[PDB]
Ligand SMILES: *[C@@H]1O[C@H](CO)[C@@H](O[C@@H]2O[C@H](CO)[C@@H](O[C@@H]3O[C@H](CO[C@H]4O[C@H](CO)[C@@H](O)[C@H](O[C@H]5O[C@H](CO)[C@@H](O)[C@H](O)[C@@H]5O[C@H]5O[C@H](CO)[C@@H](O)[C@H](O)[C@@H]5O)[C@@H]4O)[C@@H](O)[C@H](O[C@H]4O[C@H](CO)[C@@H](O)[C@H](O)[C@@H]4O[C@H]4O[C@H](CO)[C@@H](O)[C@H](O)[C@@H]4O)[C@@H]3O)[C@H](O)[C@H]2NC(C)=O)[C@H](O)[C@H]1NC(C)=O
Ligand SMILES: C[C@]12CN(C(=O)OCc3ccc(OC(F)(F)F)cc3)C[C@@H]1CN(C(=O)c1ccc(S(N)(=O)=O)cc1)C2
Ligand SMILES: [Ca+2]
Ligand SMILES: [Cl-]
Ligand SMILES: [K+]
């Protein structure tokens with residue numbers, strides 16, 4: 051109930067919300083059915099439109115007008131945005147040359163440059179180039195300020211998950227808004243685009259920027275605008291707020307546009323109808339900048355122009371139907387569209403089985419345009435699993451397609467030509483970032499980055515301490531002229547041991563054998579030096595990784611590789627090796643096929659054993675440093691040490707062997723040498739974070755050898771590929787992956803073919819940031835380079851995407 055009989059007199063777009071049944075005058079009262087009776091009349095004036103004309107100049111203040119052209123309007127803070135242009139012979143902001151803003155130029159009483167976030171729904175990254183002729187204001191912001199060629203949204207690339215990720219710095223799995231539509235089984239409640247449940251605070255986790263600001267004494271404009279408030283009015287309201295007295299004036303503001311998304315859905319991302327929405331957004335940017343200029347704020351405010359996601363061509367006819375795969379289609383609930391999420395229609399039905407639903411959906415049709423996953427098997431880069439609102443069964447839908455339950459769902463609901471929501475690596479899903487103002491750099495292009503990073507930067511812009519989030523604070527320092535955040539490297543928590551030779555061969559009873567009993571003073575000081583770290587500068591190029599948790603581990607040196615060997619997990623946490631352009635690939639000699647050798651530096655009690663692998667009929671083993679890349683027949687024996695062994699399903703060994711035999715050398719050839727760090731990952735609770743030992747769900751049968759959920763590799767080289775990886779004077783180039791360690795290759799539909807037809811495709815799908823690996827392992831990489839730490843942070847957030855131009 052609202053007693054809608056109070057009044058908005060002098061309260062129009064009030065900043066503090068009043069509590070029902072008292073009537074509201076804030077920019078959200080409409081959405082709650084709570085506005086006072088006179089809200090439209092007082093607060094939503096439209097008379098005479100949005101612009102001054104020659105004949106309105108110096109008019110007598112008529113309070114009924116939408117905006118004003120009277121002499122007193124500047125001091126009132128309510129002129130039309132083109133007032134000075136029409137009536138005072140001023141130029142529009144867009145017509146002025148750009149001039150570097152070296153320092154904030156702010157009216158007296160401003161304690162900090164205000165921040166204005168101008169968010170545009172569905173603004174695909176290529177609109178910047180393709181619509182440039184019709185967006186002169188946006189283009190000026192872009193070329194004069196700091197811009198990225200695109201910004202990566204989060205998955206799913208829908209509006210709510212992305213705007214709330216912008217506001218919090220969190221992955222959807224952590225902030226809780228995991229789609230535009232959700233069921234939370236704990237609440238037994240559903241979240242929908244339409245309706246009232248979405249307003250309940252229990253959906254919205256983390257701490258969004260407006261709450262972070264308020265808690266730390268920085269006042270915020272109210273971020274959300276009711277759909278019926280026209281754009282012109284939103285701008286005028288922001289401009290009016292900026293005229294409040296110092297003690298009342300917010301420092302941070304948000305504008306949101308439903309365009310171009312609204313039209314993109316109807317006409318497709320490049321429909322001829324899309325030009326007008328782009329012109330109209332540009333005109334709105336023009337109104338804001340002209341309005342700031344009138345208030346002498348155009349060289350004081352930092353403006354961020356940011357999108358939530360792009361838009362792809364998608365039509366009704368490109369829909370896959372679950373009714374073409376499943377017999378039991380009525381026993382499931384599907385969240386449909388550009389992603390799929392499946393659960394049982396009824397929790398009382400004990401005949402529901404996810405294993406058989408997944409199998410019925412797996413590689414069933416030659417050109418199948420979706421792929422089913424258990425959520426924990428989704429690419430780790432999507433960070434889309436650790437939330438009870440995310441159903442166990444997920445369908446990743448190919449770009450340009452939909453998934454629906456039954457045909458009736460599509461024609462009893464072609465309307466649309468655009469949609470979005472797909473995998474956040476998809477080119478058409480990328481969106482925009484421009485920063486313009488005193489605190490951003492001048493005429494600077496920065497590489498693409500992810501929208502989870504922006505919260506930290508928005509906090510830096512406002513002098514706020516960010517709540518804990520998934521950005522990597524300092525990774526976007528290169529966007530900023532000042533207010534940079536200068537982090538220190540995390541402290542190493544565990545120091546390694548450096549074991550020498552301590553065990554005799556006969557102390558080991560591991561059930562392992564090797565054909566290695568064949569017998570030199572010249573070459574015997576040589577082997578000793580190698581085991582003491584003589585070649586370590588070659589193979590460990592960026593320092594050893596730091597272990598950021600409490601554990602017991604040994605550094606092990608070898609001719610061709612160095613490893614940090616965990617006495618707790620019985621295998622390396624990391625193995626580091628460098629492969630030059632010139633390196634040669636050899637085979638595993640016949641006599642050494644099943645060779646595993648005790649490591650006399652490491653106790654039998656802290657070693658794996660071959661008997662466990664023999665007994666475990668499902669599980670085989672692989673090696674972290676690849677025997678194929680040994681530098682000499684003699685060095686090859688090191689690759690067969692029990693301390694280089696890791697557990698691997700036979701199906702996974704197909705993947706791993708092709709990576710090690712073919713791909714590593716291919717990259718070294720293409721990149722002029724590579725440094726590789728590989729290792730296991732254990733993430734049994736799929737939270738993106740390193741497991742402790744007591745979280746491990748699977749061991750090699752009859753042993754304490756834990757089975758990894760994933761294997762990573764970090765592959766580093768010189769960005770200037772004229773220099774070899776091991777003699778690089780400047781910036782680095784990296785690509786990484788986190789491959790799922792699975793007992794089958796059901797994910798790859800072409801896996802009965804030769805590994806040259808499917809393995810690299812699988813690896814590309816599981817591309818990762820070094821930072822993703824850092825979370826999953828508790829390791830910190832690149833500790834010793836000649837590069838600045840912020841540069842290294844940017845490198846650690848880099849994702850190699852494998853999309854074309
Ligand atoms: C991305 O960045 C984010 C933010 O930094 C990272 O997420 C953090 O990770 C931490 C480790 O997982 C986690 O710390 C835990 O906090 C628990 C208290 O949680 C509440 O308080 C915070 C602070 O305000 C709040 O943010 C939380 O909000 C969550 O939950 C509500 C709903 O309940 C949601 O509205 C909200 O969206 C958010 O949900 C997300 O996180 C939760 C986990 O908290 C997930 O379950 C959800 O799926 C969702 O993803 C909370 O309101 C605290 O209780 C934990 O302490 C336990 O573990 C420690 C280990 O140190 C142990 O010693 C303690 O005893 C305790 O164990 C006890 O409880 C266990 C479980 O019941 C039980 O098994 C034991 O026996 C014990 O009884 C823990 O410290 C932190 O909460 C989140 N923060 C956020 C916002 O998500 C994230 O990791 C980053 N991602 C990556 C890949 O890097
Ligand atoms: C919620 C809302 C955005 N809103 C609003 O005023 O937002 C202000 C804001 C600005 C910046 C923020 O973050 C920051 F500053 F950090 F960048 C956060 C919020 C009103 C719109 C209603 N909405 C929809 O109806 C809607 C629209 C489209 C889709 S779809 N089909 O997925 O495209 C789905 C739903 C979206
Ligand atoms: Ca984990
Ligand atoms: Cl959704
Ligand atoms: K076996």
Ligand code: NA
Nearest residue numbers: 795796798801
């Ligand atoms: Na297969």
Ligand SMILES: [Zn+2]
Nearest residue numbers: 172311315470
């Ligand atoms: Zn949309």
